[PDB]
Amino acid sequence: SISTSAEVYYEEAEEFLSKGDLVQACEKYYKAAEEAIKLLVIENNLKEITNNVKGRWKSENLFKASKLLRSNNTEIPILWKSAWTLHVEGFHELSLNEKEVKKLKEDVRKLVIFAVNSLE
């Protein structure tokens, strides 16, 4: 009934995309992905990585988390890669076209909803 942090970042990424701000959108889509993973870690209750937690997490934790979550849903480790691509090549390298961003962001959407679902 109340939006998750994951859902909010996605909506904000969507806004930036609509206004042509690809750099900002990519970063928000990635943040949306990071939150989706945290939510999923919390729900599936993975003490392993949460203990490894010492604000935002270390990229390696997210990668670990995505791997570890392959048991719950085979696709998340690969949806996560797309998020990473958006992060590096998108926000940092500034080398992704609008068509490419849309393609990757779509994998984030699927990730976001998976999380939202693990709740209810």
Number of helices: 6
Structurally, the number of domains stands at 1
* Terminus-to-terminus distance: 10 Å
What is the alpha-carbon Rg in Å?
A: 14 Å
Organism: Saccharolobus solfataricus (Sulfolobus solfataricus)
Protein name: Orf c02003 protein
InterPro entries: PaREP1 (IPR010268)
PDB class: structural genomics, unknown function
Can you lay out the helices and strands and say which pair or pack?
Layout: H1 5-18, H2 22-44, H3 47-51, H4 59-68, H5 76-92, H6 98-119
PDB class: structural genomics, unknown function
Keywords: P95883, nesg, SSO2109, Structural Genomics, PSI-2, Protein Structure Initiative, Northeast Structural Genomics Consortium, unknown function
Assembly: monomeric
Describe this structure in words.
Pfam families: PaREP1 (PF05942). By secondary structure, this protein is mostly helical. It has a single domain, classed as Up-down Bundle (Four Helix Bundle (Hemerythrin (Met), subunit A)). The longest helix is centred in the N-terminal third of the chain and has 23 residues. The termini are close together.
